[PDB]
C-alpha cells in the first residue's frame, strides 16, 4: 500500500500518542479549555485594548513631533510577554490572565495555572497561541494579561472575571488534580486483550 | 501462571536472590528506579517496540548465570554419541590434511 512521507507520519503518530498516554495533571489541565462563547466574550474586551501597530505608533510620534515644531493620559494596553506577565502575576497586578494551550515546550507554561491560583489571579487557558498571537500584532503569544482598563469598561472586565472564574474555574476544579489520557479505542482494547491473553500460560 | 527464566540477566537476579547476597528488601527497594512507573498498557506497538530496543538497562551478568541458561536451554538431542563421534573424527582428519600439506 502507498507510503506516507516521514514528516506526515511523525506528526500523526504524535497525535495518537497524546490520546493514548496518561499525562500528569499539570499537562492534563491544558486539555480543558473554555468554550466558544467565553472565548468570544473575552476577545470582545481584549480587542478594545489592543496594542498599537508599528505603523500607527510612527504616526503618533510624527504627530507629536510636528506639534512641537509649530496632557496625555496613561496608555492602557493588553500586556504580553512571558517574563512580563509572570512578573505581573507575582506582583499581583494582573487582573485576568489568558494562557495558550499549545506551547511547544510545555514547560514554559506548566507552572502558570499553579502560579495564578496561589496568587489568587483568575486565569483561563485559551485555545490557540496563534489567536493570542494575532491579538497583539505578532505571530505567536504564549500568554496575555490585563492589568487595568479604562473607566468605561471596568464593569465588563469584572463581569468577564466573574464569568471566567465561575464558568471555567469551577469545572476544572473537579478535574485538574487527576491524570489525563487513556482514550483507548476499539483497536487498542483488542490489542490489550490479546496481550493479557498471551501472558496467561507462561510469562517468559 | 508459569514463570520461566530464559534470559541470562534474570538468571543473574535469581543467583543473587537465592544466595544470601540480595534480600527481599533490597530487590523491592531497588525496583523504584527510572524504569519504574512507566505505563505499557494501551500504548501502540510501534511506540513500545522502539522503546524495548533502546531501553534495555545496563547491569552486568555473571558467567555462572549464563552457564545455567545454556544448560537449561540445551536440547535433548544436542550432544548424542553419534554426533560427538563424527565431530572428533572430523577434527582428526583436519589435522591429517595439514600434515599432508606440510609434507
Amino acid at each position: 500500500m502507498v507510503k506516507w512521507p516521514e514528516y506526515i507520519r511523525l506528526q500523526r503518530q504524535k497525535k495518537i500518542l497524546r490520546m493514548r498516554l496518561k499525562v500528569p495533571p499539570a499537562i492534563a489541565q491544558f486539555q480543558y479549555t473554555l468554550d466558544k462563547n467565553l472565548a468570544a466574550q473575552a476577545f470582545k474586551l481584549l480587542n478594545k485594548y489592543r496594542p498599537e501597530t508599528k505603523q500607527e505608533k510612527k504616526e503618533r510620534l510624527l504627530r507629536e513631533a510636528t506639534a512641537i515644531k509649530e496632557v496625555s493620559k496613561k496608555p492602557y494596553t493588553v500586556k504580553y510577554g512571558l517574563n512580563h506577565v509572570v512578573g505581573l502575576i507575582e506582583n499581583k497586578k494582573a487582573s485576568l490572565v489568558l494562557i495558550a494551550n499549545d506551547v511547544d515546550p510545555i514547560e514554559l507554561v506548566v507552572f502558570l495555572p499553579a502560579l495564578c491560583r496561589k496568587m489568587g489571579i483568575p486565569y483561563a487557558i485559551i485555545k490557540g497561541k496563534a489567536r493570542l498571537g494575532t491579538l497583539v500584532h505578532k505571530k505567536t503569544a504564549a500568554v496575555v494579561a490585563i492589568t487595568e482598563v479604562r473607566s468605561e469598561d471596568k464593569n465588563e472586565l469584572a463581569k468577564l472575571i466573574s464569568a471566567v472564574k465561575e464558568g471555567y474555574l469551577e469545572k476544572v476544579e473537579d478535574t485538574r488534580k487527576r491524570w489525563g489520557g487513556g482514550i483507548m479505542g476499539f483497536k487498542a482494547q483488542k490489542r490489550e486483550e490479546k496481550r493479557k491473553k498471551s501472558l496467561e500460560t507462561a510469562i517468559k | 501462571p508459569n514463570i520461566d527464566i530464559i534470559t541470562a540477566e534474570a538468571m543473574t537476579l535469581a543467583h543473587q536472590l537465592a544466595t544470601g547476597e540480595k534480600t527481599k528488601a533490597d530487590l523491592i527497594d531497588e525496583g523504584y528506579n527510572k524504569y519504574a512507573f512507566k505505563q505499557k498498557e494501551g500504548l501502540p506497538d510501534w511506540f513500545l517496540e522502539d522503546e524495548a530496543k533502546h531501553d534495555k538497562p545496563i547491569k552486568p551478568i555473571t558467567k555462572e548465570a549464563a552457564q545455567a541458561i545454556k544448560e537449561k536451554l540445551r536440547a535433548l538431542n544436542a550432544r548424542p554419541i553419534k554426533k560427538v563421534a563424527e565431530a572428533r573424527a572430523r577434527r582428526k582428519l583436519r589435522q591429517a590434511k595439514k600434515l599432508e600439506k606440510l609434507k
Binding site: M1, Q13, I16 | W46
Partner: peptide
C-alpha cells in the same frame, strides 16, 4: 475523534514495514 481509524492504518504500515524488512533474508522466507 478518539483516533481509532488513524490508529488502524498506522499499525497496518508498521506491520507491513516489519514483514518487508524481515523478508530481506532468505532464511525468514
Amino acid at each position: 475523534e478518539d483516533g481509532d481509524q488513524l490508529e488502524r492504518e498506522l499499525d497496518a504500515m508498521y506491520e507491513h514495514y516489519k514483514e518487508r524488512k524481515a523478508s530481506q533474508d532468505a532464511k525468514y522466507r
